[PDB]
């Protein structure tokens, strides 16, 4: 949902060269994609690429 994009926000700044450098967050989050926190990297990555389509 739109809320899932918020998790990509913090992972968006860690994104570089079109890559998601998702760091280890001391506070674990529960993803809805079926992953634990790690989803931010698997979700934000696909969410950070969508912005590249605007190019």
Query: Dihedral (C-alpha) 30, 10, 8, 14: value to the nearest 10 degrees?
Result: -120
Rounded CA gap, 24 and 13, in Å? Answer: 14
What's 37's DSSP letter?
S
User: Three-class SS of residue 13?
Assistant: helix
| Residue 29: partners with Cβ closer than 8 Å, 6 or more residues away | 7, 36, 37, 40
Q: What is the domain count for the chain?
A: 1
Rounded CA gap, 43 and 32, in Å? Answer: 10
Structural domain that includes position 18: 1-55
Rounded CA gap, 41 and 26, in Å? Answer: 15
The answer to whether 20 and 44 are in contact (CB under 8 A) is yes
How far from the centroid of its chain's Cα atoms is residue 26's Cα? Answer: 16
Q: How was this structure determined?
A: NMR
Residue 31 belongs to domain with CATH number: 3.30.60.30
């Amino acid at each position: 949902k739109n809320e899932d994009q918020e998790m990509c926000h913090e992972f968006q700044a860690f994104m570089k060269n079109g890559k998601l450098f998702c760091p280890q967050d001391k506070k674990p989050i529960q993803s809805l994609d079926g992953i634990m926190f790690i989803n931010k990297c698997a979700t934000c990555k696909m969410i950070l690429e969508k912005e590249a389509k605007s190019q």
